Amino acid sequence: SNIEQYIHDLDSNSFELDLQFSEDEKRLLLEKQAGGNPWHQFVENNLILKMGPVDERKGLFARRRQLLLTEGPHLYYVDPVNKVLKGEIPWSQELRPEAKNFKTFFVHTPNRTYYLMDPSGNAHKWCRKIQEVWRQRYQ
C-alpha cells in the first residue's frame, strides 16, 4: 500500500498529505488518522490534509491555534491547550489565501479576512495547500 508515500510529517503536530491518492488509499489514510491523530475528534471524520500551529491576530493578542485543512473542504481551528474546537474559516469559492511574507498569510472570506501567522516561517506552504484544494474543488 506504501500509504506512507503520501504523508509528510514534520512532527507530532504538523504534516501535509500529497493529494494524489486513490479512494481505497483515502480510506486507509482515514483509518490511520482515527487510530493515531489526537485532533481527529475535532474534524467531523474528515480526512486531514494539512495541520499545524498558526497564530490568529485577533482581539488584544494572538491566539495560538491548531489549524486543520480537511476534506470538505474545511478549515477548522482548535485551541491546542484546552483541546476545544474554536471555529472554522468558512469555505466557499470566494475564499482566497494570500501570503504577505514568509510568516504571515491572510485568508479572505466574504465577511472576514483572517490574519494568520505561521511561527515556523512557512506561510506559503499553507497558502499553496489551501489553493491546491481550492483548485481541485472549483475546477
- AA identity, residue 84: V
What count of other Cβ atoms lies within 10 Å of the Cβ of residue 58?
12
CA atoms within 13 A on the CB side of 12: 2
Q: How many domains, the chain?
A: 1
Q: State the resolution, in angstroms.
A: 1.8
**Residue-range definition of the domain harbouring residue 124:** 1-139
Give the CATH number, domain containing residue 107: 2.30.29.30
* Pairing of β 84-89 and β 96-99: unpaired
Q: Are 116 and 100 in contact (CB under 8 A)?
A: no
Query: Grid coordinates in use for 82?
Result: 484546552
Residue 20 CB contacts under 8 Å (≥ 6 apart), including other chains: 6
Tell me the DSSP string of the chain.
--GGGGEEEEETTEEEE-S---HHHHHHHHHHHHHH-TTGGGTTTPPEEEEEEEEE--TTSPEEEEEEEETTTEEEEEETTTTEEEEEEPPSTT-EEEE-SSSEEEEEETTEEEEEE-TTS-HHHHHHHHHHHHHHHH-
